[PDB]
Structure formats: structure tokens, C-alpha cells
Amino acid sequence: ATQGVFTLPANTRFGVTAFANSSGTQTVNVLVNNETAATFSGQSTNNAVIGTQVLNSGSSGKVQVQVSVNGRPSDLVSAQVILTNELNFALVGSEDGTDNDYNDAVVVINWPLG
Amino acid sequence: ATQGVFTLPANTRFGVTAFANSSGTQTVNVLVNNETAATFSGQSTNNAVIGTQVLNSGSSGKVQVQVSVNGRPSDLVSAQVILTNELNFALVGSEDGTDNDYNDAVVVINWPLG
């Protein structure tokens, strides 16, 4: 199944934050309306925030996360969770190797803001 | 000249607090006797208190503050101020970019406590 793709309400601000847990440098691309809207990159084995950004979901609301290490796309797992019918989380994990801990790059999208 | 290095009275409790004023995520490390004793991290352009902690200066009393943004060390400014010969402040400012506001991570050490 397709992973890392979320349909948000249109024209809505959201936060996107990426953490790194891998000896390989993580590259996180955030697409809105099928166009690159933000790119993070960093290396950490200690969950360091390699990027955090406020973006707008645009007219389509389609937000997509991609993760790659040294040009190799990582395998993605994702889900969306909604608390008290208001607070939304779009969660992404990624795996760049073989140990299958899927924390190599962790991406959290949250909305609404403000 | 060296910045962010302070000699405190030995074996004295001191407070260390970090504020963030930057789009880049700040990482503040506090070393006591050249050993990492605390690490704060956060991203804010509105002076969020990304960390505060009570540490012990130990037998050496040597305290050093380091600031980094996604692996790149920030340039530091520092000084110590003593009020009415009793109240101590060790102040650190840091610059991670080019605008030279030196508030990107602001670290305040204060002693004595209690």
C-alpha cells in the first residue's frame, strides 16, 4: 500500500518535524500539491531534530513525505490518528537498511496550528 | 578569545537555562569538568525555554557551554556578572547564521541557589 501520503483539509497550516536515528544522513522531502515544499537533511543516532517547519496544505490538501539516504529511497510506514475529533497526527517512519527498526527518519505532521 | 567557559566555585549547585530565537533547531551542551552534563534542544523564534536544570560544578568548578545547529558549531559571546558581591550570572549568546543578533541560543547560568 501507498505510504507517507496524507490528505489534509485544504489551505490549512500544519507543522512537519523530522527526527534522525541512523548512521546514514537522512534526507526528508515534504511535497504539497505534488511539488517539493520543504527539504530536511541531517545525521543523528540520538533522535535529533534535523528539521521543523510550518507549511500550508494548499488547494488540494495532498501532503506527501519522502525519505532517502545517499540517493536511496527508504521504505515507509505511515498512519493518521485523530484525538477528540480535533487534533490530527500524520506519522511516518522509515527504514534505510536491514534491521527494520523503522526509526531511521521519523516524520511527524500535526494540525491544526495556532 | 575563548567564550562560554566559566570557573565557578567548586562543588556548588548552579542553574543553567537555554532560550531559543532561531529558525534552526538549537542544541546546547553543558560540560562540567570537560564532561557533558546536560543537553538541551529546541526550535523557537519566540524565546522558548528549551531547557533548564540544576547541576553541580564539581571539584574543578569548570563549566563550559557549547551550541550547535544540525552539527555546525555556533559562534559564542560570553561574560560573567556579579551583583552585590554575591549573585552571579554567567551569560552566553550564540550566532548560527549571518544576521549577527547572537540570540539564536541564549544560555544563562546563575548561582548560588537555594
Partner: peptide
């Protein structure tokens, strides 16, 4: 740099 769209 900006193309890319490298952001913090």
C-alpha cells in the same frame, strides 16, 4: 539552497 527548498 532554494530549489531544493532546503528549510530549517
Amino acid at each position: 539552497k532554494k530549489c531544493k527548498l532546503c528549510l530549517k
